[PDB]
Amino acid sequence: ILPMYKLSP
Amino acid sequence: MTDLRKLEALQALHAELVAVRQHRFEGLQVLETLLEEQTDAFKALIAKPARDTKDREALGKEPKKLKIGEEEYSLNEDFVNDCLKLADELDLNEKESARILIDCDAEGDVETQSRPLWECGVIRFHQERKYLLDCMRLILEIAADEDIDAGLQESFGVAAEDKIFGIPPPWERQVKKFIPRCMEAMKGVRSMLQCMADKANARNMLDNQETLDFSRLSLVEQHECLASILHAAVQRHHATIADFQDFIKILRKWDKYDHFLIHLIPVLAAYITEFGSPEGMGDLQQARRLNDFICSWALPVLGAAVRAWWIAEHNGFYLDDTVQDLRGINLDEEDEQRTKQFLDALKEGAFDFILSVAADCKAQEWQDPSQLGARQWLQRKIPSLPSEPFPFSHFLQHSLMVHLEGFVDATISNLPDVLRKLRTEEDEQRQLRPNHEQDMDLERFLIIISYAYEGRPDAAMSFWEDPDSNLAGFLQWASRRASTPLVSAFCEMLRCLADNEECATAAHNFLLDEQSLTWSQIFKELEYFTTKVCSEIEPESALMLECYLRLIAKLATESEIARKRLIMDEDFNLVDTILKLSVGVIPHRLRACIFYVLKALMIRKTHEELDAMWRWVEAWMTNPFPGPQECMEMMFREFGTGFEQSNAFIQLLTTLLVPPEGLNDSVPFPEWLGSSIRTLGIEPYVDFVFDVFANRTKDISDPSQLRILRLSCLDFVMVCLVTFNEDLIVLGHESNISIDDAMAATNLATYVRLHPFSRVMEWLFNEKVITSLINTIHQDPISLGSASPDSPLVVSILRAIQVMIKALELQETYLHLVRPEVLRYQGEAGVRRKPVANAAYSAFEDGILSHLSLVVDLGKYCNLGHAELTLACLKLLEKISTSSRILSAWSPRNKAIVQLERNGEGETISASLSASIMATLDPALAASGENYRVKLAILDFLYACLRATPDQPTIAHQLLGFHCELSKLGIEPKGPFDMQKSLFHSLLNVLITLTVSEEEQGMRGYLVTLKYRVLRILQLLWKSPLSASLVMDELRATNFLFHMLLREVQIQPQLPWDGQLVTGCEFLLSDASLAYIDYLASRAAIFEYIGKELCSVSQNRIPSIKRQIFDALNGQIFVPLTIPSIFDFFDFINTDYKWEEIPSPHFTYLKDLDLGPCIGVHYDIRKAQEILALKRKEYEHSQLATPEFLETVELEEKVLIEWLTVRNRANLLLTARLNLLQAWANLLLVMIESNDFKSTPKMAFLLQALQAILPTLEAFSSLKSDEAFELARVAKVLLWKLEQFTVGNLIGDKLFQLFQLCLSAISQCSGTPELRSLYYSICYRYLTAVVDTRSVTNARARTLKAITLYGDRLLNVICDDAYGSDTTCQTAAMILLNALVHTSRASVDCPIIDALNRLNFIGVLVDSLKEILNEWASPSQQYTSAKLALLLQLCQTRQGAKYVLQANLFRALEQSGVFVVALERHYALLVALARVVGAAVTARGAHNIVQGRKFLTQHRGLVVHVLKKNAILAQQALEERIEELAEAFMLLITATGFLEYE
Amino acid sequence: VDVDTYLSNLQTKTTLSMIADGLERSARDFDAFLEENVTLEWEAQRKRIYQHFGIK
């Protein structure tokens, strides 16, 4: 549901 | 990206070429890199591999795995079907066709266009040829640009020779030439287009119509590009005779007339120029053969034009006999042959075809109504174009005009005798048979010359520079006696040759005498026709008059000397003649031309010219040859029939209403306009204009005419409204009659009565006007989509929206300061006016609240891209949502929510808004980027819609993606907001993906403003409880706080704001203060949100998120990524800037002028400006060195204005810092309170916070009483919620330092009683827990020193706080004294108790003991406890008995008459009193026993009951008091010795 | 339940705890003083004389 909201820099 | 496919490579390359063409060389190094990667592309213009059977049979046999180049793909039954379909429609190879389809799947354009996958392959294929060929035109175009560097101009030149023409450069070096490939290339486009129509027409005789149209457009564009490339290549002398013969044969085999022939025309022109003219392959012998070869045709006009052009170009050889050889050749025979050939070509219709082509080339969708019917009165027998949408380019038109002007020059400099004989033949023919119309060869030739010389002053000047050249010779020879057609053609040529002012002045000087045409004959003919019409007229006369009028208007609009001469010429009197002609019986065209001539003459005028024009208008409208009131209306109605004259009359009025100084007093019209006759002045004009625009808008069939008329009316209304003074009238009605004299009142009265603003406002309240407006704004979307940005519909809609905005703004001012004055004037004097307003419509919103589709149309018009229109619609919607009556009528269920949910309008509106806000901006055009302006407009609209009526939902909630229900909201399944794809989520994304930290400037301003607006919208959405829970859930479900923290940036005094430093004095005057306040507010909002989320997670008792929250606060992130802790952001408190201190200049004058009337700290500048202006006027009237000392007052005012601005900015910064400090304190309190984690690890952060606040408290100990409050309470709770040796020393050290600043403030009585109370609690626990063993003695000793330093000054303040107004201050102060006396005894006497007696504290304290029953959980109860408790302590020391006994406490406790849970409290009071008396008697000795016996004897019996009583929880507590009470008296008995008395 | 009332409740609890601690400390000090004054001599006689004089 969170494709880009992840905190994966 | 870097790995771009073929399509993306050509699209990106095209953008680079445009940059270099538009004077942008920022991509030179990047441009060369692309030509090397696409070398194989430029080699072959267009070539499609033939459909092979090897791939057809193999593709369908094993449609499982496909291998193209290095990558591999998997084919399925669905994709394989698209390959065969694409290959069949375009006859393309299966391998190449598959690659095209694969590019679509990767890029994913199927969703961007929502079309079948096989159809996208056709578009993608056409795009390649478009850019592949279009980019080549830019290379050659830039290589020939003379306005660029010579070096760069040569780089693209040699590159094109090798990349396009396949010719290697000079430094190096079976293959086929370029032309034969280009000819075959264009051939494929024709065969492909022909087979397309055959197959398409068969099936047509669907959703692919637009795709077929786009493909045809791409094909015609590619053909035009190939033609231009061929022309450019031929311009470099890279052709031969075979190509020329092939082109001539192709032309001879031409079937139909279309755009392709017009595109090929310039090719043949360049061919003849290179070969025919002596400017190329100058082989005289070769030219002879080509002459006989050119001199089968399926269209004779083509051959005629070709022969004429060839003769014109090749007749330049036979001019002299020195530059070439002409021996053994006869001249007269060849001359006669060429003459007869040219005559035959003319008879066949060469010039006719040339003129038809020139006309069809510049075919414009809309034309100015000022030149209707011009150059359209000939006999055109050539068939016209099919009217298909094939617009032309600009370079093609430029080349065509250049070739036409060259041909004109050649024909004029080579064949003069031909033109002479043709003119003589036409003249004699018209003479011998006037009834018949002779040929129009000369007229058509002059019209072609005019078309060629249009908008090109560089070439038109050639007709004026050398008056002895062939051009000027022909110009002067064509002005002799002739017929009406030739004169009209010459006038049209002159008009078109006046593109600028210099050419206009040259034509003016050449027309008048210094025979050729002169103004004298023109005016003579005008007067003759006027007298004939006034005592029929032929079309030729009307055409001549129209041409003369157009020429005069053009000369007046372009030239100034003619405008100033003819306007006041006594011998011409053109105005009288044109008026006498207009008042006659003639068609509307002449009236329109006369009106346009008047407008042109009155484009630039002065007061005298305005007066003369008004005088003439009044004289000709009052008695036009019947009363004047009737004649004027008759003339107005006569000028109302049609559209041309009406628009023309309207533009003239609009121009006349403009003042001579340009677009405040002196209304632009004479005050005595119409004073003679009984008329209201200029009102009739506006009344008639409004009546027309309201009623006669249905008799216009042509939509273009209706749009133009509506635009003219809107422009007239705007010019009438913008010329109204608002602030002037406000200040007048405010101070003129109340303060100023009654002299100027008449001026303002006349201005308000004569200005047409009142009449316009009155008309605006009519239903016809608003109905016409909403009908004009209500149009289909397809029209606006296919229309051009300069379309009249968009301009009319914009003008209408602007008029509506102005009306909504000025309605209040009107209804306030116009209606009553006008009514009073009409009642006093005699005025006859007809009302045109509706009394029911109390406001402008009443007439528009009945239209529901208005908002729908305004929202749909946001997907057009027009910046101005989008901003206007957003402002209109914002103003509508800001009103009250509209939302009261809509929501008295609701109407807007159901109107916007008819066919999914809200969804598409939200999608368009999201797509818009996601569009990037131009870093260079920060404040000029239309995208940023649209974003700010949308944000302001949302802010205004959410701030107004937050409790009740609005359209903003629906646009965000919420289900607006009656007094309730909700989310739907699979909706746009549920899938995290809506406006709110788009805002969140654009916010979290925004970086403000820059290097070149750093801490930008517009980014700060954008994020501040976003945060304000978020706060407005959060505070609303109707949309709070769901928003918080959606935020915590995406880790928004984490993104915000990651986006945080530290602030320091070194980082400048927009290249400007903070310490600079200009900082307070610059705009950086706004950005700083915005950043402070953003930090405050972020801290508040973090605190709220922490409180929520704590009350939810779930440690899953508490760990992550603490880690983020500790400075680590486990996905470890580190971030600055909260203590790092505590850098906004800095007193070095001295925002409170301000340098006060000397101000030797104006010092007494205060800011009383200026002052929500907001000091108005006008309140002081008026005062200083009055003072300056008084000083000037005093007549004492007024000229010299004026500059002093001027500079003092210039300093005072900046002083006021700096004070306002300082107040704003101070309040922002206060809010930020309050938010930070609240966050810290919420963090400390709700924290289950251990305290020994957080002791480090505690000590760090203490160290950070120490200087803050030391700097604001007695400065202000607002910041200390937030910082005083945090230290209070912190002190109560409390290797080890090192930490114990630092804590005790600061606790001692913190103890000093508290007593220092108490000694000075600083701050309010509330702040003064917190200090008591801090010092209380410090003297009770810290101090209360050599270490203890040192601390206790030094502690008492601080108290003794102040002395009575400190105790005096504490004693006054007691028994005061406040309830908590007196309580804390009373308890504080207990700790002081208690700790002092531990250090037989005490100085603290002694001071209390000198301050009269013990005296008043014992006096308050009376009526204690009235005072005695409750605040009053706890207060008395500390009171009696204190007295008990003083009775324990030996010295207290002396001072206490002298207060006569025995008589004080007698006047009061004081002698399961409720009873317990009763005994608590008796015990307190008994202890004070018991300890007092046994303190001194036998001097007080005499009083104790009286107390027991006077109150005997009561104590007996207690002593005998003593001899579940509440019960034990009650009995405990009895034991203490019983034992209390027992101590007094044994101590007093009552037993001895018996 | 709400951030606005949270700080108010915290301040109220702190004030109540401070008042309770002060009252307890005052009571303990008074009790210690009374014990130190009575432990000198005549611990039970002071009450025995009264029990003998007055009605038991």
Side-chain angles (χ1 to χ4, degrees), chain B residues 275-292:
Chain B
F275 292 83
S277 174
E279 302 298 346
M281 309 300 180
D283 189 330
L284 202 172
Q285 287 69 2
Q286 182 174 216
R288 303 297 301 276
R289 301 186 299 92
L290 301 177
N291 180 88
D292 299 70

Side-chain angles (χ1 to χ4, degrees), chain B residues 58-74:
Chain B
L59 180 60
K61 183 64 176 61
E62 51 279 343
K64 300 180 180 180
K65 300 175 66 177
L66 182 61
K67 301 181 180 180
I68 304 300
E70 184 177 0
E71 300 295 350
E72 298 74 4
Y73 301 90
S74 180

